[PDB]
Design a protein around this ligand. Structure first.
Ligand code: HEM
Ligand code: HEM
Ligand SMILES: Cc1cc(N)nc(COC[C@H](CN)OCc2cc(C)cc(N)n2)c1
Ligand SMILES: Cc1cc(N)nc(COC[C@H](CN)OCc2cc(C)cc(N)n2)c1
Ligand SMILES: C[C@H](O)[C@H](O)[C@H]1CNc2nc(N)[nH]c(=O)c2N1
Ligand SMILES: C[C@H](O)[C@H](O)[C@H]1CNc2nc(N)[nH]c(=O)c2N1
Ligand SMILES: [Zn+2]
Lengths: 405, 403
């Protein structure tokens, strides 16, 4: 009967219909002729004003004052401001709500059960690269909280007509260096070769290890980026050991505690926050499966399998699968021992199922990107594998943006 | 526009041009993607699908434009104009069935697409005849463990009448018997078909691995029950290479995956009974059939036999057990000399297939959620490969249950 996508869970046999998707104001990449759901990156006064009104309407609905006089007065305030200045500005509580709503709207995040619990640091007063650095250190200190991690976002000033952007050049606040070698290989994280080379071009004295923490390149409006070294005491890392395989610690592998995305755009009511880094805590598979075992990342599967004495000469020994499991276990064990927050892919996906049920009742749906939500090991052992998902774009949102260089 | 398709492991980029030949809408729209959903929510038309298919065929043998090509289009046209339908030549049927497989977005085994034995069963007028054909298919496809891909094609749908159908979802399936206390004994996915077999006269067993009889249906007739001779049905007892207690679980699985509920569409003609088979990829058995919570659900038993700490997700007890079961499946198929492919070799060969199809057709329709295996996803190259999903014809399609 219902004219909304029907969504089925094949493990439980239950059905829902997503009505939320009708609030999408904006096309993804798919069409009736071809699905592009698996692509990572497929590619103004009245326009602004209607984005702004929709957002203000969301905020007033969220505080149950929709249609109220404070609501119609805010709408007028906003149009008046666009009328005379081309842009407008958010009230503090509007920013807080919009930030949370952007996380809650992110289809690619499995951690969204935590969406209501986000510390929002307003850094819209920031006026220099040096001040960005202070805010960022404060953020990292707050978020890290000695291992007991707290979700957080710091919001720097919005894009402004004619004037340059605030940008953090690094893709995350904490990243490891990647040094291109003479034999064409890479030492450290190959994902970070470009930003590494950029840091060196901007005067950084590079180290030569596999786990060198990168410095930050921070750009304030209409200035060249400036370089800032994080005090090592601020950057919590966990050395990786394995609970029974005693040789595993001898590998010198490690990972940083804080996953802090710094190159995304936070869009709220048409306003564009080009620097707005946000952080949570890790799901174990991000470290132990992707960052450590992708062939284009640290690529350690074969070395670990050799240490475990597996038959790496044939696919059918399942040597990759066994090594990857042990690496994931080491990641979980080591984070637990160090009392640094982490969540395994089972607990995370169970919690995401609870999130979907919360959001079914609250908004009638939840946009979700199945390829990104299902973990990269043990897929069908998690309940999200058996759950259909509808993917669409809502605002507020975190959006990709081109690299500043 | 032609979508850009990137491999994130290798940095390489292609453009799918083949998607332009899609004539048939999927579930997605610009407002929302529905690609993770399993199921979807006259004469001129048949004639254009017919012409298009005859063109694909004459081009496939290089004789595009020839006398033979024109006379064949006119035959198709003369037949439709007079009867509202037409019939395929055996050689066309063979081509169309291979193309349907080639085109199947959810199949990771398509490197094999050109090697397909096709039995024409269009001269079949009875459920009894269907049974004989099915036994021959099984015997041939199984080949004493050296499995060979095959399809048998029964008579097409016709406006005047009921369809030929095989009620079972595969030719070989294990019974699931509901217990008065809710539980299922056997394969919970086959409870309905098991019950249908019982009501049409089957004497049920009571094991966890009882091979079902087939319900075959000729048009507008009640379906009929046929027991497969047990020697036709190759099974593999599961054991583990190092864990001796694993064989004590009494697990086993059948060699032959042979889908028998899907519709084969070729040039607008529809073949409601057209069972097809290949060989398994180990994860289908090891991960989905044995470990899915709504299938035989054995993860916990295995974890306990391995003495794992089951009380917390963070021991990765599930992951550890799933890996041993998959290992047991590969080992036991290898020991019994029955064809199987593991998920690494299979996905490596699919990458090769993508590359072949890029050169041959300018693209390949693929359903990423079904191509990427259910364990160790990102350990396989297909995880890192962007894919474009779309429907080309000839095609295998879902159809309603006949009851
Ligand atoms: C609280 C713990 C959190 C967990 C466990 C978590 C987990 C994850 C995971 C596993 C991913 C996929 C990452 C990848 O494969 O590259 C992700 C993506 C994402 N999460 Fe979270 N998340 C958390 C908190 C946050 C917070 C606080 C925000 C924003 C306020 C957020 C926004 C995002 C976004 C935008 C993405 C997509 C990134 C992209 O497309 O590249 N998440 N989350
Ligand atoms: C030769 C070895 C073959 C292998 C290893 C293979 C592998 C697979 C696998 C793993 C799937 C996913 C199945 C599932 O999760 O339920 C699949 C689906 C499928 N394959 Fe194959 N395949 C093979 C041969 C064939 C042949 C011969 C045909 C047809 C002539 C075929 C047509 C299909 C179709 C239509 C699907 C989709 C089924 C559905 O939507 O439920 N494949 N294949
Ligand atoms: C290729 C690439 C693109 C892009 N936008 N970002 C990166 C690296 O950013 C890290 C990655 C983004 N998918 O996010 C990891 C993450 C973030 C958060 C907030 C929590 C968490 N557990 N995990 C690489
Ligand atoms: C729910 C359902 C639908 C349907 N069409 N078939 C089934 C049972 O068949 C399972 C599956 C098709 N989804 O077959 C697996 C398979 C088929 C083939 C030809 C090869 C292979 N390795 N594996 C269940
Ligand atoms: C091609 C494919 O879309 C790509 O490799 C995706 C798949 N799923 C993912 N899922 C997560 N969580 N993170 C990723 O980087 C990716 N990569
Ligand atoms: C909802 C989701 O699409 C569903 O669980 C799919 C996922 N991928 C799959 N992939 C294969 N090969 N077979 C399946 O049954 C499924 N199930
Ligand atoms: Zn789609």
């Amino acid at each position: 009967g219902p004219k909304f996508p029907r969504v089925k869970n094949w493990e439980l046999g239950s059905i829902t219909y997503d009505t939320l998707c009708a609030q999408s104001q904006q096309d993804g990449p798919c069409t009736p002729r071809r699905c592009l759901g698996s692509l990572v990156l497929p590619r103004p006064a009245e326009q602004l004003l209607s984005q702004a009104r929709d957002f203000i309407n969301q905020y007033y609905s969220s505080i149950k004052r929709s249609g109220s006089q404070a609501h119609e007065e805010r709408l007028q305030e906003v149009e008046a401001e666009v009328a005379s200045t081309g842009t407008y500005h958010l009230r503090e509580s509007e920013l807080v709500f919009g930030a949370k709503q952007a996380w809650r709207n992110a289809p690619r995040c499995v951690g969204r059960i935590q969406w209501g619990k986000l510390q929002v640091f307003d850094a819209r007063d920031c006026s220099s690269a040096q001040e960005m650095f202070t805010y960022i250190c404060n953020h990292i200190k707050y978020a890290t909280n000695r291992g007991n991690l707290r979700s957080a976002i710091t919001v720097f000033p919005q894009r402004a007509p004619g004037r340059g952007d605030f940008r953090i050049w690094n893709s995350q606040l904490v990243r490891y260096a990647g040094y291109r070698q003479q034999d064409g290989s890479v030492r450290g994280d190959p994902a970070n070769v470009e930003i590494t080379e950029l840091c060196i071009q901007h005067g950084w004295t590079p180290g030569n290890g596999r786990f060198d923490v990168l410095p930050l390149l921070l750009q304030a409006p209409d200035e060249a980026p400036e370089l800032f070294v994080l005090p090592p005491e601020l950057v919590l890392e966990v050395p990786l050991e394995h609970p029974t395989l005693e040789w595993f610690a001898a590998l010198g592998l490690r990972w940083y505690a804080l996953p802090a995305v710094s190159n995304m755009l936070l869009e709220i009511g048409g306003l564009e926050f080009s620097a707005a880094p946000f952080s949570g805590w890790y799901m174990s598979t991000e470290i132990g499966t992707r960052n450590l075992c992708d062939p284009h990342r640290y690529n350690i599967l074969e070395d670990v399998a050799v240490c475990m004495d597996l038959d790496t000469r044939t696919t059918s020994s399942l040597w990759k699968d066994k090594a990857a499991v042990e690496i994931n276990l080491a990641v979980l064990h080591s984070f637990q021992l160090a009392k640094v927050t982490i969540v395994d892919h089972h607990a995370a996906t169970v919690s995401f199922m609870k999130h979907l049920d919360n959001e079914q009742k609250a908004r009638g749906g939840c946009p979700a990107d199945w390829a990104w939500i299902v973990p990269p090991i043990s897929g069908s052992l998690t309940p999200v594998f058996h759950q259909e998902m509808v993917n669409y774009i809502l605002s507020p949102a975190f959006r990709y943006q081109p690299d500043p260089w």
